[PDB]
């Protein structure tokens, strides 16, 4: 019931203001045997950020050869095992610091960036399109607005892949019905249409207590069926689908119980969720890390796989 199950890779997205910043030093790609590895665990889906700086460094203005060399490069490592590839641009609704919406950078800029990859990955059904990562400080109808316009550019190009459309607000499924942050990502979000029907509503959910996955702390071992309900909850009343572009939970008896009634939540909701993707693996994380999958030089699993793999291979 389940379609999509994985990690992000983390990697490409380091060092976010180096531009065009050093490969191998500032950001990297992940390496052929990290998809093998993952895809050994049961995990058909691979989240793949990169830097809006990085593929085109100038707005409106072609794509780095180089930069989309790499992104393809591990379009074919996912395609060699069986894996999707959600291209996340994962950049906060910013470029070069400045917000989407700024005279700066106008929303008809992610248009034409998302224009640029479609264009490039239409023709590969194991491509998904992650429009924006955690979009912020741009309200829900404006953020609204950049997502419809930059749908419509996918769709021009004659692009049939699944877009994943976040919120505002970091996108929190917690946070998809309230107000704190002005206007709902529920109600803004209510007018989007996608010609080509296949859109995907991207919430991202933490544990902790601000949900921001800052602390390595589960607040309950029920917390996150309590915070997915009131997006689950509009998705099926509005017949959309979700997936959970990022999640984690720290090596604990808490935090365990916490994601194995997590998981277990989004099998039973699998009418409305398409899948989801864990943060994080890939190999630059520090040993201090609370959220990495990324097996150990020696090879061993880390806390957490034992428990996503049991839920990825059961999908």
Not at 213 to 239: A, H, I, M, Y
Not at 287 to 306: E, I, L
Request: net charge positive; charged share 20%.
């Amino acid at each position: 019931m389940l379609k999509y199950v994985g990690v992000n890779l983390s990697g490409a997205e380091f060092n976010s203001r180096k531009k065009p910043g050093t490969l191998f030093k500032d950001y990297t790609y992940p390496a052929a045997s990290d998809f093998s590895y993952f895809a050994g665990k049961g995990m058909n889906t691979i989240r793949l950020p990169f830097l809006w700086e990085r593929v085109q460094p100038e707005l409106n203005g072609p794509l780095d050869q180089a930069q989309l060399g790499l992104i393809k490069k591990s379009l074919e490592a996912a395609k060699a095992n069986k894996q999707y590839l959600i291209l996340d641009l994962h950049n906060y609704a910013t470029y070069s610091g400045k917000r989407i919406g700024t005279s700066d950078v106008p929303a008809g800029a992610l248009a034409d960036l998302w224009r640029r990859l479609a264009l490039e990955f239409k023709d590969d059904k194991a491509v998904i399109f992650g429009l924006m990562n955690e979009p912020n400080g741009i309200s829900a109808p404006d953020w609204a607005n950049a997502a419809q316009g930059t749908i419509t550019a996918i769709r021009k190009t004659g692009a049939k892949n699944l877009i994943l459309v976040p919120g505002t607000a970091y996108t929190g499924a917690w946070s998809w019905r309230s107000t704190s942050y002005g206007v709902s990502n529920a109600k803004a979000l209510e007018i989007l249409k996608d010609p080509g029907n296949n859109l995907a509503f991207e919430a991202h959910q933490y544990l902790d207590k601000d949900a921001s996955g800052t602390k390595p702390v589960c607040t309950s071992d029920s917390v996150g069926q309590e915070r997915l309900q009131g997006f689950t909850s509009w998705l099926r009343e509005n017949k959309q689908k979700g997936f959970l572009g990022e999640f984690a939970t720290a090596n604990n008896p808490v935090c365990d119980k916490a994601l194995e009634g997590m998981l277990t939540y989004m099998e039973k909701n699998s009418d409305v969720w398409l899948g989801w993707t864990w943060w994080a693996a890939g190999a630059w994380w520090k040993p201090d890390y609370p959220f990495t999958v990324q097996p150990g030089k020696d090879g061993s699993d880390k806390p957490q796989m034992a428990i996503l793999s049991k839920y990825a291979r059961r999908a």
